[PDB]
Amino acid sequence: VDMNVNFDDIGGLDNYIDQLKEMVALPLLYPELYQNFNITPPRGVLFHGPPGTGKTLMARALAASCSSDERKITFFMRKGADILSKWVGEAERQLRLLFEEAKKHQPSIIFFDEIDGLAPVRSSKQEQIHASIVSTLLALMDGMDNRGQVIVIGATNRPDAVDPALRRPGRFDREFYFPLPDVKARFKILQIQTRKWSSPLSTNFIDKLAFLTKGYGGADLRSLCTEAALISIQRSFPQIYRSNDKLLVDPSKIKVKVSDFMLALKKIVPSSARSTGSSPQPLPELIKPLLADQLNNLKNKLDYMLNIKDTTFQRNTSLLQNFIDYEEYSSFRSYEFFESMAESQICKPRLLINGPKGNGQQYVGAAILNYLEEFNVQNLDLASLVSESSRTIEAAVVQSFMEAKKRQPSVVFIPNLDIWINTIPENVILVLSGLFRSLQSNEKILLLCLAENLDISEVKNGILSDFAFDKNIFQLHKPSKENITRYFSNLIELLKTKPSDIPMKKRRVKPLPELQKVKELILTPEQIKKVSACLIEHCQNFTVSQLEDVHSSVAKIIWKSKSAWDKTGTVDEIIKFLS
Amino acid sequence: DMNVNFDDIGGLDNYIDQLKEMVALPLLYPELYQNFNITPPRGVLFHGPPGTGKTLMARALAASCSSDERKITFFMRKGADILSKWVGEAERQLRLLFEEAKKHQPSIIFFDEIDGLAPVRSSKQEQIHASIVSTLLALMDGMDNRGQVIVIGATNRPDAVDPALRRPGRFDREFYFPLPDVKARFKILQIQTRKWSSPLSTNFIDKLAFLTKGYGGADLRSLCTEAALISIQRSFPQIYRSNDKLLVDPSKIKVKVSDFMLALKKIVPSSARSTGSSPQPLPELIKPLLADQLNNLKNKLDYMLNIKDTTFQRNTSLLQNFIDYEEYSSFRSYEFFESMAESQICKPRLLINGPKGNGQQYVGAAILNYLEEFNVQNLDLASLVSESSRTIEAAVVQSFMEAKKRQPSVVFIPNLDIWINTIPENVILVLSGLFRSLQSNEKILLLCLAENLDISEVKNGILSDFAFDKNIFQLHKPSKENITRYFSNLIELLKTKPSDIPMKKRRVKPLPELQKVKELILTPEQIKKVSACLIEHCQNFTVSQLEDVHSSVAKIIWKSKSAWDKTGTVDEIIKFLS
Ligand SMILES: Nc1ncnc2c1ncn2[C@@H]1O[C@H](COP(=O)(O)OP(=O)(O)O)[C@@H](O)[C@H]1O
Ligand SMILES: Nc1ncnc2c1ncn2[C@@H]1O[C@H](COP(=O)(O)OP(=O)(O)O)[C@@H](O)[C@H]1O
């Protein structure tokens, strides 16, 4: 955990790399520029984000990248709260020694991993053992004497657990949020992990993997690549898994194929799925004909509410690159006026999706959350509120809304609003509404709620009246005839397939070599048309759930006779079922 | 430790004067302590919010008291840095510390983060911490009658220090470092932006001090550092791409207004890191809508709180009032006049009520931003039930207690209509009983903002005992002139040229490497039609509805930011307002 990593290993965090250069490498090479204004370079950064986003990798790359020249950067790394012992002496004494030896080797980086355990928040009881550590840490990090060129880096899952006196200029003046990688950063991470391989993958395959890995972190992508490689080893040379002696194998023709990555995709569960909220994922390919017609409309509406496709201001992905490629150009009437009139476009982002019971709302919500890739999703659903048994409903709601306030582009998500307004206490809705009306108009905190058979009277003169769902109510109407036709057309395409097409795996004729130790398908188109007509007629004024039920029931019948070439039996069974 | 002089610290002149007294006059004018059988003050305890100048004050005291004609030595021990696993070796270290601080006649001692070194009295934990606090008590209580050991103590929470160490004998004077106000932030920014090659205009520094509410000294320093760093990035970006030193020269790196305005959006003050934000002035866009009725709301607050006069301690430092003012029959006269000066506050109450969504969140924030010297205690829902352990009762009582400690305080209750429903009856009655057990002269202001609050609730209801009799301010919907100004500001974007819009353009030529050592058509008739339709459509509208119309029309206007034939945009604006 010391070396052999650099900044080309890191993918999708190019904005923070520039600032870390600006605080570590740049002062060393150019001390005249910093001393020109009599400023001290910022020292100490608090990395926080979802686990497996690259904080420790970022710190190691900082330590090993700025030391490429003949200016060594010693890297003192401390695990979370591993310094306190059973007595009262060593806890502060060892921190003292750490900072003194950091002073000795003047260009140095102390990395407190999991700093939330070393410096907890001051609770009601058990004060001494952690207060005596926090006080001395505060004393050495911003003492009277010049600490020197010691860059203090802390890493945490959440920053609220660190003492606020640490989150102060001179100690932790910069706080870096490491976000879950988007599609481009995931593409770059996949390219990086599959860079040293002997048989590189194609670019389009990496793009498709990046699309398929929505919700993954960097760590999840690395685990996926490792699992794909392990499956490739298992597929090429299974014999090494049986013998206890080292057989002779060749690191060749062990190229990874798509089938191995697909299997690793089911073997790996992301950190998105471990969470209790709704995992943002695109519309599954089966239901896409049914819903995508009315999902695009929502996107268009969202496009007119959050100004997603109209991004001329607040396009800050990387300030340094902006200064590199773009070019500047009285003062107030050219910056303040236009900035204000650009942020004046978001008034009060709200959206309530309300459809009949079972009309694929769990699907539309996930698709919308996937479209808003750059937004910070906060789930106010019942499961997330009640999952932390120590917290209360009100406390969880306040925590979620306050988290959504920072990281301004964010979405407060309330799936199953009809259940939510019936199982939550009446005062929590009032607290949330007071929080939302205590917001500025130009704030991009979208309130997206999905409800099943919600009465409009409850929104007009009920408890949800003070959320301002006036024009922002979208009705998810039942799917039309053409979408049902496309759904069952895919079903029929499954029906009229030859058994030589349906993938049956194998039965190998010859055993694996030992290693040296060291008919025609009969289906008239008339029957296909009759089955299509019966499916269309049976599902009249049906929702998405009923259509899925009919699809599953018919797919069972079709897959039953997946080898029979005379498909009249499956056809008459299908017709009999729809009666 | 640098050569920081006292002219580096800004906004704490009184404490600088007191420290100069207690450091020099005991040793420069010794006879004045004989006629009065009184000892010089021995202990001083600095306390306040983080990043205010405690360590700066100690470092300035060290640097100033080191010169040719007199020597003063500084001894620093950091918080709990003196203890070890050995049982009584910490006692030996502290005792020998005081021995060298006594053997050297000239030496003053400083304990940074004293609350960690000396916590409160130990009910449990009879371990070495209690022995350390007892030895500190018994060792700094006295070993020299009228000596030269000054024990300074820096801390963030003064209440975490052992009460036996806060005494007329040990830690005599307790100094409170406040978050700087506008005048002090001006001086701090001048001190930071002093040695720059191209100083800033004083109006810009005033505007900066206006915007940086809640910023400490450290926050302003960080803001200056970030502005300089952004200037360095903007001037010489190529230094961020090379791994070896290039040749860049100063005197072309100038810190402009844009860099400061871009650094403010990324710096969050230490008073808002765990809170999210701080109360901001009235936003520029809606200023034509509410500033007409906000100024009145300021004047009332300037009448029931005596803000503009501040007849007690209005100048910089007390020694300065003794220097440049002359003092004045003082036994009864002074008591009478102090009584009459304090009798100008009866019961500061204010209930700002208006229709739904009439910009109350803006008015409350602007008012809380106006009251600079006031310790705001928020009693909203998000602050009471934020914790899952303390009850609403305990939170409300504790918040009122903290408001009572720091006497100029504003108990702030936004969304009173939701508040009188979410908060049960017992908590409202407890808060009322707390408010009726105060003196009339107490400077605790109960500020309340509500939407569509029936006055039946406030003269005969739950709030009837809070004495909101004649202090109910009515926010009415903005008049036609305010709407006209708002939409004229909106329309001025329609009249701007496509080449005038700050649309950043790609540079036609790459960055230079360094040595490796047409008039748009808009007839005024369309502008008049747009103004008339905008005015007519937003009749008797509230602030939220006006903002909705403004956003909806700004979207259409910003769609045609490059077009010159603005007839289509005007037609779309007319069509939407129908
Ligand atoms: N942005 C990224 N770019 C490249 N690799 C990443 C990124 N984020 C995570 N990784 C990979 O994930 C692995 C583990 O990351 P880790 O340091 O455990 O993150 P965290 O400390 O947040 O859990 C690293 O070895 C790294 O290769
Ligand atoms: N009153 C002040 N005037 C000028 N600078 C200040 C002031 N207070 C704090 N600072 C700045 O804060 C930094 C040190 O603050 P510090 O002493 O650490 O505050 P505290 O010890 O109260 O947290 C210095 O860089 C200094 O520039």
**Distance, CA of B548 to CA of B5 (rounded, Å):** 54
Ligand 2 centroid – CA B56 distance (Å): 5
Q: Which two tokens stand for residue B115?
A: 């609350």
List C-alpha distances in Å: A63 to A3, A115, B229: 8, 18, 22
Query: What does the alpha-carbon distance between residue A165 and residue A139 come to, in Å, rounded to a whole number?
Result: 11
Hey, which bits of B134-291 come out as E strands? 151-155, 173-176
CA–CA distance, A264 with A228 (Å, rounded to integer): 5
Contact B548 A307 (CB under 8 A): no
Closest C-alpha to B118, from A138, A142, A132:
A132
- Spatial separation of the C-alpha atoms in residues A134 and A166, rounded to whole Å: 8
Q: Is B228 exposed, middle or buried (0-12, 13-18, 19+ CB in 10 A)?
A: buried
**Helix, strand, or coil here: A446?**
strand
Query: Sign of the C-alpha dihedral, residues A240, A242, A245, A248?
Result: negative
The β-bridge partners of B44 are: B152, B173
User: Which two tokens mark A412?
Assistant: 């407060």
Under DSSP, is residue A122 helix (H, G, I), strand (E, B) or coil?
coil
H helices then E strands: how many in chain B?
22, 11
Question: Across the interface, do A328 and B219 touch by the CB < 8 Å criterion?
Answer: no
CA dist., res. A205 & res. A189, Å (int): 14
Nearest-neighbour CA in chain B from A359: distance (Å): 31
Strand locations in B54-196, DSSP E? 73-77, 107-112, 151-155, 173-176
Q: State how far residue A349 is from chain B, nearest Cα, in angstroms.
A: 11
Task: Say how many Å lie between the CA of residue B33 and the centre of ligand 2.
Answer: 34
Distance CA A205, CA A258 (A): 8
In total, chain A counts a number of residues equal to 579
| Structure-block tokens of residue A224 | 């996926």
Beta-bridge partner residues of A421: none
| Beta carbons within 8 Å of B433's beta carbon, 6+ residues apart | none
> Nearest-CA neighbor of A384 among A339, A415, A347, A407?
A415
Give the three-class secondary structure for B199.
coil
> CB–CB of B197 and A346 under 8 A?
no
The reported resolution of this PDB entry, expressed in Å, is 3.8
Mutate to test the interface with B, among A162, A394, A444 (most CBs of B within 10 A): A394
Amino acid at A79: K
Cα distance between residue B264 and residue B258, in whole Å: 10
Backbone angles phi, psi at A188, to 5 degrees: -65, -40
A446: its two tokens: 């979208």
Please tell me which residue of chain B has the smallest CA distance to A95. B81
Residue of chain A whose Cα is closest to the Cα of B121: A128
Binding-site residues, ligand 1, Cβ < 6 A: A 9-13, 51-57, 181, 189, 192, 218-219, 222
Element (H, E) at B43: strand B43-47
Q: Of the candidates B80, B85, B422, which has its C-beta nearest A430's C-beta?
A: B422
Q: What sign does the CA torsion over B498, B499, B504, B510 have?
A: positive
Q: Which of A238, A239, A236 is nearest to A259 (CA)?
A: A236
Three-state secondary structure call for residue B280: coil
Q: Which two tokens stand for residue A52?
A: 């497996």
Q: Which two tokens stand for residue A526?
A: 């008339």
Burial B102-114 (b: 16+ CB within 10 A, else e): eeeeebbbbbbbb
Tell me how far apart the alpha carbons of residues A563 and A559 are, in angstroms, rounded to a whole number: 9
* Cβ neighbours of B239 in A, within 8 Å: 26, 29-30
State whether A87 and B85 contact (CB < 8 Å): yes
Contact check, Cβ <8 Å, A96/B81: yes
Q: How far apart are CA A342 and CA A428, in angstroms?
A: 34
Positions of chain breaks in chain A, given as the residue before each break (C to N > 2.5 Å): 329, 518
Does residue A78 contact residue A111 with C-beta atoms inside 8 Å? Answer: yes
Task: Please give the order of strands across the beta sheet that includes B73-77.
Answer: B73-77, B107-112, B151-155, B43-47, B173-176
Sequence-ordered alpha helix ranges (H) in B165-248: 182-192, 202-211, 217-235
Identify residue B225 by its one-letter amino acid code.
T
What interhelical angle do B425-436 and B392-405 show, nearest 10? 20
Distance A213 CA to ligand 1 centre (A): 15
Provide, as residue numbers in chain A, all residues whose Cβ is less than 8 Å from the Cβ of B73: none
Tokens of A91: 């806890």
Work out the number of other CB atoms within 10 angstroms of the CB of residue B500: 12
**Dihedral, CA of residue A302, residue A306, residue A311 and residue A313, to nearest 10:** 180
Q: What does DSSP assign to residue A24?
A: I
**Would you call B55 and A310 a contact, using CB atoms and an 8 Å cutoff?**
no
Residue B20, token pair as written in the block: 């100069």
Strand partners, A136: none
| Burial status of residue B221 (CB atoms within 10 A of its CB: 0-12, 13-18, 19 or more) | buried
Which residue in this structure is represented by tokens 């909101």? Answer: B468
The pair of structure tokens assigned to B42 is 């021995």
Closest CA to A555 of A497, A480, A468: A497
Q: Which two tokens stand for residue A546?
A: 């009923």
* Count of residues making up chain B: 578
DSSP state of A488: H
Pocket test for ligand 2, best of B56, B113, B156, B179 (most atoms within 8 A of CB): B56
Task: Point out the residue among A18, A33, A93 whose CB comes nearest to the CB of B250.
Answer: A33
Taking residue A390's Cβ as centre, other Cβ atoms within 10 Å add up to 8
Q: Do A530 and A567 contact (CB within 8 A), yes or no?
A: no
Distance between CA A102 and CA A75 in Å, rounded?
9
8 A C-beta contact, residue B468 and residue B458: yes
A310, A348, A434: residue with CB nearest B418? A434
Q: Please answer yes or no on whether B253 and A33 come within 8 Å at the CB atom.
A: yes
Helix (H) or strand (E) segment spanning residue A410:
strand A410-415
Ligand lying closest to the C-alpha of residue B215: 2
- Produce one character per residue of B382-397: b if its CB has 16 or more CB atoms within 10 Å, e if not: bbbbbeeeeebeebbe
Contact A485, A539 (CB under 8 A): no
- Sign of the torsion angle spanned by Cα atoms A527, A533, A537, A539: positive
Residues with CB under 6 A from ligand 2: A 142, 170; B 9-12, 50-56, 188, 191, 217-218, 221
State the Cα–Cα distance between residues A116 and A128, nearest whole angstrom.
Answer: 16
Q: Which residues contact A405 (CB under 8 A, 6 or more apart)?
A: A439, A443, A445, B276, B277
B43 contacts B150 by C-beta, under 8 angstroms: yes
SS3 of residue B387 by DSSP: coil
Residue B490: in which H helix or E strand, if any?
Answer: helix B480-495
Closest ligand to residue A15's CA: 1
Asked if A37 and B228 touch (Cβ cutoff 8 Å), the reply is: yes
Treating both helix axes as pointing N-terminal to C-terminal, what angle do B182-192 and B217-235 enclose, rounded to 10 degrees? Answer: 40
